Design a protein around this ligand. Sequence first.
Ligand SMILES: OC[C@H]1O[C@H](O[C@H]2[C@H](O)[C@@H](O)[C@@H](O[C@H]3[C@H](O)[C@@H](O)[C@@H](OC[C@H]4O[C@H](O[C@H]5[C@H](O)[C@@H](O)[C@H](O)O[C@@H]5CO)[C@H](O)[C@@H](O)[C@@H]4O)O[C@@H]3CO)O[C@@H]2CO)[C@H](O)[C@@H](O)[C@@H]1O
Ligand SMILES: OC[C@H]1O[C@H](O[C@H]2[C@H](O)[C@@H](O)[C@@H](O[C@H]3[C@H](O)[C@@H](O)[C@H](O)O[C@@H]3CO)O[C@@H]2CO)[C@H](O)[C@@H](O)[C@@H]1O
Ligand SMILES: [Ca+2]
Ligand SMILES: [Ca+2]
Ligand SMILES: [Ca+2]
Length: 637
Amino acid sequence: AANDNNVEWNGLFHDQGPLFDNAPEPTSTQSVTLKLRTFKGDITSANIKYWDTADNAFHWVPMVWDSNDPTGTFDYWKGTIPASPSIKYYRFQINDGTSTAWYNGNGPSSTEPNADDFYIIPNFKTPDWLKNGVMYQIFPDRFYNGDSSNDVQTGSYTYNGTPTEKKAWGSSVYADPGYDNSLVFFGGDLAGIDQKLGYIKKTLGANILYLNPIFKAPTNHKYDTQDYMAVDPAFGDNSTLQTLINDIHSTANGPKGYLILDGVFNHTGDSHPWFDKYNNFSSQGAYESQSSPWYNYYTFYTWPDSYASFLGFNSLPKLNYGNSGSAVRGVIYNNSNSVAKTYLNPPYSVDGWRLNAAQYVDANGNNGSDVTNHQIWSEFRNAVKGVNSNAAIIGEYWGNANPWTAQGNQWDAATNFDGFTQPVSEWITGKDYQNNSASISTTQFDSWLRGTRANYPTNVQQSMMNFLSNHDITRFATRSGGDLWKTYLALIFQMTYVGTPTIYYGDEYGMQGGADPDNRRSFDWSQATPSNSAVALTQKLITIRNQYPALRTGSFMTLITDDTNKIYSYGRFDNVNRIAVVLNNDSVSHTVNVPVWQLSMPNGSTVTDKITGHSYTVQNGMVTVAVDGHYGAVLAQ
Ligand SMILES: OC[C@H]1O[C@H](O[C@H]2[C@H](O)[C@@H](O)[C@@H](O[C@H]3[C@H](O)[C@@H](O)[C@@H](OC[C@H]4O[C@H](O[C@H]5[C@H](O)[C@@H](O)[C@H](O)O[C@@H]5CO)[C@H](O)[C@@H](O)[C@@H]4O)O[C@@H]3CO)O[C@@H]2CO)[C@H](O)[C@@H](O)[C@@H]1O
Ligand SMILES: OC[C@H]1O[C@H](O[C@H]2[C@H](O)[C@@H](O)[C@@H](O[C@H]3[C@H](O)[C@@H](O)[C@H](O)O[C@@H]3CO)O[C@@H]2CO)[C@H](O)[C@@H](O)[C@@H]1O
Ligand SMILES: [Ca+2]
Ligand SMILES: [Ca+2]
Ligand SMILES: [Ca+2]
């Protein structure tokens, strides 16, 4: 490069990784020094332009040359944004004589962007254990039956007139004639999860557990809460939970663990005493009397049969949050004995909450996604972080969750359906997560990923829950048509991408399953071993991620987007390691020239493909590697 009235886009780069930002999560008194990469001697000047919410105006910070990279190929320009409590957004203006280019969260541009600027949110922090960990999601009744004495039996009880049905482990989840799909129980419990912590924390290596609802409720999914204060008898008792938590946090069965519970706060079940639609309690619930002490906890359009609920489901009456200080906000998060604080405080001390249907939480029966909804989650954060600043808050949202994360006053992250699950599914399986035909090319995949990462602050990105499948969508192995190699490819991407890799129980061995409830099959333990190829790969990838901080918090740079051969390559790097991932989404092998020079991997240096174990030497800035179809390479040094 040179001063030739032309800014070379390929040499430009910046994100909030270690090499380019010295304060990714600054407090009110910490200044932020940023570095912009360009090819060596390519430009004449660069400036940081940032919007300050403190005064609703743009501010200018001229950059100065700082240094070259070890290969002498690039220059690093530096600039510092002053310290203050205000949220700020920034982009770069890069000049080389008569040539000008812009750069922000969405990469380089000729015209000045008006969206996707990088974020600076003083005092906003997301749990570092969440950024660096691997999550394992468990649907309680379907994981492991550690205590058959608490098993729900066929006819143990009835809900809305229908008796419960017990089914042999491994059998179909579909209820037999006369029974209901939501009242089918296999026996999985908390004791079981406890006895299997070794498999989770050692055989696989995950250190974070996320459980679906475990509080008293008549159904098998239990999102129709009957009593937030009690673990459901089928799963054990509150004492069992205390022990499970202690064993999760313990290091006697593997690395220190963390527990995240599912918080169903938008609604209760219709059998909850506050509502009591079937009169299961002597007390008078809202449905029973307009004089009920909990009458105002819900919203009736025409008492008592027409009331606000989740998506119109009468079994899930929607909670009325009212105004700040209300009784509902009280029992949900403000009170010391609220659902949120009770489990965050000892004797429980869980590590976080996954907020079910978080977008709908509101007052007066409204549908959320409004000022009140955001105000509520703001108060929720103050409540949670006040008890444990290291407790995670992950909201359920299938789209762009920027509104609940970008101001640093609500969630730490969200279920990454839009920035991970969907794009990964359409690129690799040619199906959306509902198993409908929907395919995207490699260039679309890369653009989709970048655009969605840009929706969030960096710490949020690193904390997103990235799962291949979950209890609300079809199994990845089913969308892939049973081709285990597609699962291999997906796992390699998952474990090397930005965000918390999240494994939906069973996905590690290729469990299949269609739409709810077939996506909640009981776990086949004969597959919970390295003998199973997908399990062996999962364990290896988790070891790799744990071995390289660059994969968890390092920078992300696109390297190759080949639509003809379906080759996708990107690099993850920091001050210590440089890793170039090469994914082959084609059905045939391809020999790829990986441009590792972009990550500043020195010519003559060696790299090791952590997948095959083969080593290569960097030559002419490249690493030539033959990658098998529906497989990948993780070239690290
Ligand atoms: O027989 C006719 C009917 O059969 C089939 O559907 C019926 C089901 O088989 C029945 O079990 C019954 O379903 C109701 C549930 O019993 C009741 O608990 C309630 O459940 C709703 C929903 O709750 C959760 O969903 C959460 C999501 O995970 C989350 O993404 C979202 O944000 O929040 C949701 C609420 O917390 C469970 O996970 C999920 O599994 C449950 O579906 O309501 C159910 C619907 O009334 O009745 C069904 C009647 O349709 C069959 O599918 C249907 O076509 C037939 O007409
Ligand atoms: O800022 C004023 C000058 O800016 C421009 O020159 C830049 C170069 O573009 C940049 O590469 C860097 O050059 C240094 C080089 O990287 C390093 O290897 C060498 O040892 O020292 C060089 C100079 O320090 O920094 C200079 C700025 O000093 C612009 O081209 C020039 O006309 C401006 O005067
Ligand atoms: Ca130039
Ligand atoms: Ca049991
Ligand atoms: Ca009653």
